[PDB]
Amino acid sequence: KVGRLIYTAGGYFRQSLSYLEAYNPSNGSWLRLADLQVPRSGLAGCVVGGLLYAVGGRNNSPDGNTDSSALDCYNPMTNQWSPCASMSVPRNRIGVGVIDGHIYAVGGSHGCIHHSSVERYEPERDEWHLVAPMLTRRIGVGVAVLNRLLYAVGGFDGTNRLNSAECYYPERNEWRMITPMNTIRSGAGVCVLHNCIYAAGGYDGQDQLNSVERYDVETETWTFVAPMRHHRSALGITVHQGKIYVLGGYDGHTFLDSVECYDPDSDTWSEVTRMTSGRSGVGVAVTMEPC
Numbered sequence: 001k002v003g004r005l006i007y008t009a010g011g012y013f014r015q016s017l018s019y020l021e022a023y024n025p026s027n028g029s030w031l032r033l034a035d036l037q038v039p040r041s042g043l044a045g046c047v048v049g050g051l052l053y054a055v056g057g058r059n060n061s062p063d064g065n066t067d068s069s070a071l072d073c074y075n076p077m078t079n080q081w082s083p084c085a086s087m088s089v090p091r092n093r094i095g096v097g098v099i100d101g102h103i104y105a106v107g108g109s110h111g112c113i114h115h116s117s118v119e120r121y122e123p124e125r126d127e128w129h130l131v132a133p134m135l136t137r138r139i140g141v142g143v144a145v146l147n148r149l150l151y152a153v154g155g156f157d158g159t160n161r162l163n164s165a166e167c168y169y170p171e172r173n174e175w176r177m178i179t180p181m182n183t184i185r186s187g188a189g190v191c192v193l194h195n196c197i198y199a200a201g202g203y204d205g206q207d208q209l210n211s212v213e214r215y216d217v218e219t220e221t222w223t224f225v226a227p228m229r230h231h232r233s234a235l236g237i238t239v240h241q242g243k244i245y246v247l248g249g250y251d252g253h254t255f256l257d258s259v260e261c262y263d264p265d266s267d268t269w270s271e272v273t274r275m276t277s278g279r280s281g282v283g284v285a286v287t288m289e290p291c
């Protein structure tokens, strides 16, 4: 269990960013690692087999906006990025989850197109294949996996921001609606901790949110927990050693550098570190320290 870092890839502040930086909760340190080959915001990160993957996003730059179909793999042992097979379609403001060593890419946008499509990556074969689409088009969608079921939470369908959520049952290749959240949220941070899917922050169509609610997959209810100290949309999120970490985002005024940590035992959030610069739209995952 020792030696794991929280990696943050990409993001946005004025333009899309190429940063890869890793935070060590055991000593408070940050390391700057190899830049992404292409700057991107609105991407997702995940880890399979100790490799970090950056999935989708968009390169917002002075000279244009390019939605990304890219899958890139970072090996901490070499501090190098390598291209992997690209997805079927560009997906900005994507959500990603891992089931049994396979990466699911969910939703996202391509220009004015809001995807319901979903595809699955097989690392051993370096291949993507489309699976059943969601019941709803969703960009800015939060995704997490619990008990080998994939959840897609909130987002924006092209007309409305969503409180709805749905679950993918892989053995049936089928999506079904679940209980909707109490709050409309696009660009929330979504993760799994114990037996619940958490949705933290986001944007409800009027304000960036500090509220946090969790879906108990047994009782099918959403319950609010303690709110974050900061309102934030387009935050990064991950779980590490039984606690939720939220990174950056936008509070309606500032691109935040603050990282908060949720302790479920005490139902409290505390500020644990700051990123080296404020940013939103990062991808986040946990794996072993590099080199």
Ligand SMILES: Cc1cc(O)c2cc(F)ccc2n1
Pocket: 011, 012, 041, 042, 060, 233, 234, 249, 250, 280, 281
């Ligand atoms: C106001 C605002 C907030 C974001 O979180 C953004 C993220 C992006 F990737 C690009 C633009 C953005 N603008």
